[PDB]
Subunit: 676 residues, 3 copies
């Protein structure tokens, strides 16, 4: 009778509704099991949440088990209910609520549970401590599964204690008050802190006491919105690996490391009020793949300059494939550091808080070997006028020992007459750049072809030069006498480099013929002229005139008023010329300020091969013909070499602003101090 | 009593069968809960599959919940059944069937669900879109957990929408029609497409609109079998990280990237009908660890040549530790690109679709700094005769600015008389290789020892040379007069390099003695000879004669007919010789085709130290004794230097085929244009 | 009535206890379902274990299903019970017990199951084989989730079979008998072995037969405590990726690889009885980010020397950003290898089993290009006296072709008079270091300023030198005649390098003035002295005397007895002197043993600019004034050059111990063999 009816009721689709369950862990503690391994259903952890439920099985004898409020629940009678859960725990098992609830204690219980933790959601916490080799954390993304520090909390969102080794932190977020872009911070906060070990263990990897061997992996973790540090690895910790770490929106320092013996791969740090990265006392570590951008972010309101990267008091660092870009101040400051090795390095368009003021790498009492350097300044290339670095390298001391190789000057056209290196400050440090011999340090014997002085009167006249030219007198340049220096050498297909110190006297309308190849200007003149043209109103034009290959082309540009050459000021004026590749540069030797243009590819109507068929001779301060325009002012330190890129020209200027470009290519070098 | 039978019936081992369950989600929609939080068992998602079942709990008030056919199931009365599932969703929860079923909608439901997706199986789909910061996908392997595009589908298997950021794609496969090797493709398909963002958001990382910050990780993903692209990252996307990406069997382009600001580590692309990798307008990115093989794969039937890697219109790239190998055409084509930095670069055995035709790196209007280059051509080393690159480097324009350092010629024996660089095309570009000064660009003063002419008659005779020798006449070489050039210099333990242009007159049987150290040939001769021996049938043998260290050795080889020297053709003939290290090279200066062999280690019976005991003098075109064999033809541009590796010899040939090898090692250089 | 009491009983909180269950998988085989898809609860896998339970669903039609003892259970009647389990399996489902139980068979069942395996715990095993593309393994940490080889087992803990491709091994430990530090091993054990493939399939990636394409990822795996190998990848396997692999405590070789075409990133190997890493016949591979430490670990009792890294019979390797440190013998031995490319390389403080005995890189019949080299020997820098490498580089043959660039000598102070290179053995190999021209190999013409001889008698006297000086006689140095060499050249702000061979006659108390800048010693003397001061007891002090910038400073040190200069022994004595930067070096040219000190930064009271104001001339063997102290012994091979770092000085000594430092900086070089 009732039997058949009971069975049919239980057999309907909703039949599970008739099996009772505990409505809270509090009920579970008041439910005594009557048999071993007894199964019980938990509807939820805390009454009225519908979260944290599951199935439990009983141990009648609970001695040796401890109530942990989520996976081991003990009854008054001493039994233990064990959550059926083979693998990872999650905070809801310990009473987490999600939303805006403070889930600190549930989360702390997970990482203390003896198993890895899965973040399935976002949880607010104040401060969490990772203590054990079981304290791993996994999410399923850099954003939606995350810990989020409460607005009222200070200190470290996560602290990795010195008892915690061999864990994985993978694919979750660690967010602070300022995680969303453009929002404010809570003072005194850090995303992840790895404390300094207080001792050394002898039973690794089974240690339960302090040990310096972190031997742990932070993998695809997103840290965002903290005040003092995103990630801060303190001294004494070994083998903290990071891999695809992403740090965003830090009020101060994105990442600080102060320890040895570690490797990071594919790190990105973006938008910090101070440095993106501080290496302070680091040694014997590796950074492989790095992007450090928008350091010294002005809206975060920090007073003072801070570089994209601080490398201080460090040694034996290999840093490969990193980029430092769009930072508000200097790119990289290397201070009091030994043996910094960098292989593939990109620094461009930093110093964005004040135009033409900061430098991409600043050396101070440091040694470094840097290869594969690049730094196309994309603001200079597009001509947008946005703030960017004054130049690539600055040396604050002369006791550095530094080697730099790469593309020191990129070689785009220069729409705004500027490039990567717009202020060049030479150094007396033990510097080698691009394998170029420093002319001041060589005893190498070279050819030195003698030019012939020409003018209406053929006696050279010498007049005073400013003392920054490093000589007493130079060659008097006048339009009336057509003072010039003629070489019989003709340009060949390998190209030529020509440079000189010129002190222009600038008055009215005038054509300055700084230097030329050949003479004349026509479809068959096979000639080059570098000219400064001044009109009656004082407007200045730098013009490159090319004739040959059956045509002519004028590559000219009007200088803005703030870039004009000034009368009586010494400039180093240089050109590189070869088929299909012409560049010019004008450098104020007193301020280091430079203007430049480079012409390749579509900027040239033709390559102008016929300029270089060994028919057109080289002349300084005019062309080779008696009727050519000349100059007004003084000339000094005339240099003829085989072709140098603008890359190498700029590189050699870090040795000295007016010396020969490349001793191994030097053809002629005439001081012109009362002799020719 | 009926109580006791019910209780006993449920208590049997199979008692669970008496608790009813829903047989489908359709039943679930027709089951109204009678209590809040009611538990219900779902047998399966779709009737008759036994897949996708689980436990659900009821919300009586389901307003604000939407039926999604998997984890939220709505009743007619408005209640909501919520699947008990804390973490990731999988397609079976939404009705996927696996096997040959089109599981597109179940999979799309997963990635739209608000949580990460776990692939537990292979699922056919047509097209999937990833839209949200929750749209992560995880598998458990590169093959068995995968999405598989249906043969009838076209377009992108996966599209990452510009609203989707901060996700992880980890450890699963994305397969197309051609995933299995040797199979055909479906026209118009792409594995993973990252679309161009249409806007910029101001509330990252909480954005719900278009944004360029992908900030996501593709990790241990296997893409195979698509037509147009495996992975295609379009313009405007930042921070798409790839890590251990594997791309296989792509009909056209393995990976295309067209954006800036990203890092990849350990990428492998294998077997593509066109490029393995296209970088098109990329900038400020990093590739760290890369293997690009079997590009331009002939069986995929693409018409035309395509390099392993195209780098076009790109800038500020750091590409470290990559290899390009076994590709059908050129290795890497760099076009219209600035500041490409490469540190540790391996290109070998490309050009496999046509022997001796393609080059490992092709530069066209580009600048690059390349360090740590290697390229052991394993086909040349094994003597297999398989198609391989003509040589390492080719310059399509002379406006490139390029530095290359490394092992340009590997230095294995040369069983088939070839090596890495078998056709050398010199360039007038702004090129620097291995830090070698280009002789045509230097004004450096060196020693230039004067040899003495010897012959039966001691008056030199001069005859014309082909115009490719770059002079009017050379030294007449005859066996009758035994014309030779004697140096008093003896070879020392650092070794020696000797080279000359020789225009051989080849007629009958004859011994040409190109150059020698010392004289005689015996156990105590302390001598070296490089000879071409021609027998009565016209067969040519290149013989290296070594005498000293108590023995003699002849290292000879018969030249195949297609490699024989031709009468009246100018060849640059060079040797480097030192204890334990001898190499020779013969270079056709009109075609650039080269033959060579190198001897170190086990190939030498002894080091032949005593050749270098400062006792044996250097001679060109004979040995030092009056009875020595001589030459027939004309000699020119005799070069003596200190020891250069074949690496540096070959590197210097890219400057010019006949000029001195190393200006810093130059001891003598005599043109022989009607003077000695 | 009774119906409501049944309902009330089933409805109590513990009501779940009334639904029966199978107490073991054996019972499940004896429980016949009476309905298709029937649900059953399994209490546990094995009776009395409380492990491996779950829910199963029945298929009455069991054809096509095979009993696997964990997830498919067959009844006597032919039904099949299928474990409800969408994703990964774990060993407890197959009867694992954990703890001290041998769980080999349960773990083997997992990896053969057709799905990936999750390790939730530590499991003892003997030997496991990975056979299928489903045989992935995931844990949740490098320690607590792991396989542990039983002490009684030998051989390979894990073998990856050549049928197994495209799997992931992620975040678990593989432990052997010696996993805990300081414990003993089981002979003949290996952690992970990748066997040599026996064939090639044509249906990759769907192959079920032998194939060389492993195409798999070992990620965050921790291998520890095995005898012969931690990880051993045998020949013929392609694309075994490792990423964040950690190997600890290996009795013999940490990692062996013997195959081609692979990439590793961020590998760490620590504490091995023999090598940390053996590359045996490897080619066309990449290692990017590596740490290899404590190789040849003395307590593991291996007899004989073994390097940190063995590279033998290998080719086309790109190895970037690795470090080898604290190894017992040599750092890296490169043998019989072509084209080894290394970019960013740190080797320091190896050879710790015997002080001053081993070298950081040992080359034997190999070619290599090494850039970004660093190696700050932290033991020499701290003055701890701990055993460390004799020096950076050693060449076992003269047929190597090697380029090295970086920080060859770091330039720290030298508290104990030593540095990175304390024994220098020059080589006749084809070697280039730091781009320095080898003086023995150059024909470059340089300046060679002639000094003037001074003495009480102005006729120089010549006496014999030891034959190791490479000349018959040198300049007789005496205190009575004050024999000296004066240069009129004055030191400038760029600095100066001075060096000479001095054969000191050491007797009583005496002041040797090896070389000087200027004369006198006072606040305005603007002078430098390098002195050896000997007192009446025989104590030797090396003193650098600096006067200028308004002050004086004496930088002196007492030599320990074992570092004293010996009478009649030739020493190469060198200084680099520049503002803020002074170093000196004393090199025994017969043993190669060197002592040295360097002064920068805080070690200097002032930069001493006024020494370099072009007022103080250079003198050898005394100062410029008639009253200066002189020397006792013989002088030879006097060298003046522009400033060289100690880095370049040391680098050039690998060419030859007594030759000029830098041909491009050479100002004077006087042999002094019976002439001035
Ligand atoms: K690298
Ligand atoms: Zn939430
Ligand atoms: Zn504070
Ligand atoms: Zn502590
Ligand atoms: Zn005139
Ligand atoms: Zn025209
Ligand atoms: Zn003109
Ligand atoms: Zn139904
Ligand atoms: Zn399937
Ligand atoms: Zn859009
Ligand atoms: Zn990685
Ligand atoms: Zn004769
Ligand atoms: Zn002979
Ligand atoms: Zn003879
Ligand atoms: Zn039983
Ligand atoms: Zn356990
Ligand atoms: Zn096999
Ligand atoms: Zn003195
Ligand atoms: Zn004083
Ligand atoms: Zn140098």
């Amino acid at each position: 009778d009732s039997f058949i009816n009971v069975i049919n009721t239980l057999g309907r689709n909703d039949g599970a509704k008739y099996i009772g369950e505990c409505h809270s862990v509090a009920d579970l503690r008041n439910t005594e099991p009557t048999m071993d391994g007894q199964r019980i259903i938990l509807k939820q952890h805390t009454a009225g949440t519908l979260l944290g439920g599951g199935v439990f099985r009983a141990l009648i004898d609970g001695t040796g088990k401890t109530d942990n409020n989520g996976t081991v629940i003990k009854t008054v009678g001493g039994a233990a209910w064990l959550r059926v859960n083979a693998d990872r725990v999650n905070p809801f098992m310990f009473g987490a609520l999600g939303g805006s609830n403070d889930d600190t204690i549930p989360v702390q219980s997970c990482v203390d549970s003896g198993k890895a933790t899965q973040l399935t959601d976002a949880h607010y916490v104040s401060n969490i401590q990772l203590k054990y080799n079981t304290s791993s954390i996994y999410g399923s993304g850099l954003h939606y599964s995350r810990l989020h520090q409460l607005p009222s909390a200070t200190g470290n969102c996560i602290t990795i204690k010195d008892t915690c080794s061999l864990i994985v932190l993978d694919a979750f977020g660690v967010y602070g008050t300022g995680a969303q872009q453009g929002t404010s911070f809570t003072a005194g906060t850090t995303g992840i802190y790895v404390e300094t070990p207080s001792g050394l263990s002898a039973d690794y990897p089974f240690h339960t006491t302090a040990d310096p061997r972190r031997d742990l992996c932070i993998s695809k973790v997103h840290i965002a919105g903290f005040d003092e540090y995103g990630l801060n690895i303190d001294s004494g910790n070994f083998s903290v690996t990071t891999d695809s770490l992403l740090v965003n929106h830090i009020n101060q320092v994105g990442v600080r490391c102060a320890t040895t013996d570690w490797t990071w791969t594919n790190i990105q740090v973006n938008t910090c009020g101070k440095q993106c990265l501080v290496l302070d006392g680091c040694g014997n570590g590796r950074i492989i793949g790095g992007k450090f951008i928008w350091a010294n972010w002005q809206p975060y309101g920090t007073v003072g300059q801070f570089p994209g990267i601080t490398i201080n008091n460090s040694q034996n660092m290999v840093i490969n494939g990193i980029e430092v870009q769009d930072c508000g101040g200097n790119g990289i400051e290397i201070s009091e550091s030994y043996s910094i090795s960098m292989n593939g390095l990109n620094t461009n368009r930093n110093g964005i808080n004040a135009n033409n003021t900061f430098y991409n790498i600043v050396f101070n009492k440091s040694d470094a070997v840097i290869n594969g350097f690049v730094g196309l300044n994309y603001a200079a290339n597009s001509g947008s006028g946005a703030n960017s670095s004054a130049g690539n390298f600055q040396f604050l001391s002369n006791d550095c020992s530094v080697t730099i190789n790469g593309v020191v000057e990129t070689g785009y056209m220069g729409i705004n007459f500027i490039g990567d290196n717009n202020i060049i400050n030479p150094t007396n440090s033990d510097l080698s750049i691009n394998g170029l011999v420093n002319y001041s340090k060589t005893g190498l014997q070279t050819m030195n072809e003698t030019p012939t002085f020409d003018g209406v009167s053929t006696t050279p006249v010498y007049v005073s030069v400013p003392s920054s030219v490093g000589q007493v007198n130079g060659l008097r340049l006048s339009q009336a006498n057509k003072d010039k220096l003629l070489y019989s050498r003709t340009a060949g297909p390998e190209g030529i480099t020509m440079a000189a110190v010129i002190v222009p006297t600038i008055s009215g309308a005038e054509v300055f013929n700084f230097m030329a190849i050949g003479s004349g200007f026509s479809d068959t003149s096979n000639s080059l002229h570098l000219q400064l043209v001044i009109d009656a109103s004082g407007k200045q034009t730098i013009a490159l005139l090319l004739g040959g290959d059956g045509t002519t082309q004028i590559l000219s540009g009007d200088l803005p008023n703030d870039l004009k050459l000034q009368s009586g000021v010494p400039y180093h004026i240089a050109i590189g010329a070869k088929p299909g590749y012409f560049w010019w540069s004008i450098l104020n030797i007193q301020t280091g300020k430079r203007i430049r243009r480079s012409f390749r590819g579509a900027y040239l109507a033709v390559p102008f091969n016929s300029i270089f068929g060994l028919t057109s001779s080289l002349t300084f301060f005019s062309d080779s013909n008696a009727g050519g325009d000349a100059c007004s002012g003084v000339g000094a330190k005339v240099y003829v070499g085989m072709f140098s890129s603008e890359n190498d020209y700029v590189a050699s200027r870090y040795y000295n602003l007016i010396n020969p470009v490349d001793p191994t290519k030097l053809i002629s070098y005439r001081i012109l101090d009362s002799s020719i």
